[PDB]
């Protein structure tokens, strides 16, 4: 069982700046036939892996020339000459020299772009949902950087705790931004006990936090 140790775990790079990912094997990775069967894979979130490099330094067909593979024995390196927006995602080294086949734990390549303020939107629950005895209020932060954003739910200004879930998108492959959804879950009865519903957003691109709110019915 050959162990592959992938470093770093995360890597933030400015667009057009070089990047390097390292993979270290527990034992020498040379096969009986004399070749070294190490591969580098890229995976955009919720997509299948694509092969970049095979046998240490050979570019697979269709792979841009900015990707280069290097190393021998235990130490191996993927290098990106200039990172592009599309290079975001997780990279894996894979060994296929000895079974069991093994992979590194992964490397997130993050793009470092200018600060972007979220666009914020608030959606009241649909009438069809309230008839089912539940109320979901959704708050959308769209196309913001960096990833660190705080969303605070207020109901007639009363601060809400433990009745909300957040989902964040992966970094966009074009404009390198994030998006975030917050969902406040209430009973129809509790939802009708209050009038003003607001989500308050705190982000590095807003000097003062931004509040979007609606009046129930009105």
């Amino acid at each position: 069982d050959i162990v592959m140790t992938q470093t770093p775990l995360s890597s933030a790079v400015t667009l057009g700046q070089p990047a390097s990912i390292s993979c270290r094997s527990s034992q020498r990775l040379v096969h009986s036939d004399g070749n070294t069967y190490l591969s580098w894979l890229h995976q955009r979130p919720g997509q299948p892996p694509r092969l970049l490099i095979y046998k240490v330094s050979l570019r697979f067909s269709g792979v841009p020339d900015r990707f280069s593979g290097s190393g021998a024995g235990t130490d191996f390196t993927l290098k990106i000459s200039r990172v592009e927006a599309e290079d975001v995602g997780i990279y894996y080294c894979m060994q296929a020299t000895q079974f069991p086949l093994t992979f590194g734990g992964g490397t997130k390549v993050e793009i470092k772009r200018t600060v972007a303020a979220p666009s914020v939107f608030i959606f009241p629950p649909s009438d069809e949902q309230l008839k089912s005895g539940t109320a979901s209020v959704v708050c959308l932060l769209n196309n913001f950087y960096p990833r660190e954003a705080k969303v605070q739910w207020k109901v007639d200004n009363a601060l809400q705790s433990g009745n909300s879930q957040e989902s964040v998108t992966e970094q966009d492959s074009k404009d390198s931004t994030y998006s975030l959804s917050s969902t406040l879950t209430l009973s129809k009865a509790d939802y009708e006990k209050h009038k003003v519903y607001a989500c308050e957003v705190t982000h590095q691109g807003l000097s003062s936090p931004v509040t979007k709110s609606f009046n129930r019915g009105e």
Binding site: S39, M94, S119, T183
Partner: protein, 212 residues
């Protein structure tokens, strides 16, 4: 040109069994070794099983030894994985991949090992307010298992679409939101329909999203 398509996935009770099939086209099936690889949710890639062209060299991961079996019908251009005595940790996205290199990967098929019952989604409109950019969406709420596919205007609208990762609720059911951003002055000019498909429950829903 190269096509790998996985099937046989879905919900299965702990101890239950599944048979995955990977159909292949656009290369000589019998000339290559075929790999099963899997991805537990939010975790990295794990090798599972490998089979030579001749079906002579078969290898299994320690995790699946005794429970799983790999076979290939070179005639039918099909790779198989019989999975028995399934456990909650076997829950993952299962890919077939070609050669040692890993040069070609299928779309992937999701396996959920849970005693919980299939439940279809409720789809609710997220209506745009009233500007600059304007947002509208669909809330896809209380389904199991994953996955759901969401499209807009049957694949016609792609510009400005974010389908968020699903969140598991205290109910043990999933909820996700799909949003599209459009220029504010383009509202009531275009029609906006979110197409939700949950195959595990044979549920297809087309919801029209209109200004409130």
């Amino acid at each position: 040109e190269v096509q790998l398509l996985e099937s046989g996935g879905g919900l299965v009770k702990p101890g239950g069994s599944l048979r995955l099939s990977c159909a292949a086209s656009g290369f000589t099936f019998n000339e290559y070794m075929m790999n099963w690889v899997r991805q537990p949710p939010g975790k990295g890639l794990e090798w599972v099983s490998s089979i030579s062209g001749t079906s002579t060299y078969i290898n299994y991961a320690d995790s699946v030894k005794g429970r799983f079996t790999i076979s290939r019908d070179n005639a039918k251009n099909s790779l198989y994985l019989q999975m028995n005595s399934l456990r909650s940790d076997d829950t993952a996205m299962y890919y077939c991949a070609r050669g040692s290199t890993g040069g070609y990967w299928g779309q992937g098929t999701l396996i959920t090992v849970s005693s919980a019952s299939t439940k279809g989604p409720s789809v609710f409109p997220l209506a745009p307010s009233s500007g600059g950019t304007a947002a509208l969406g669909c809330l896809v709420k209380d389904y199991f298992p994953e996955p759901v596919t969401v499209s807009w205007n049957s694949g016609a609208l792609t510009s400005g679409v974010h389908t968020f990762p699903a969140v598991l609720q205290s109910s043990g059911l999933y909820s996700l939101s799909s949003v599209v951003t459009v220029p504010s002055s383009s509202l009531g000019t275009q029609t906006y329909i979110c197409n939700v498909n949950h195959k595990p429950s044979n549920t297809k829903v087309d919801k029209k999203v209109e200004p409130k």
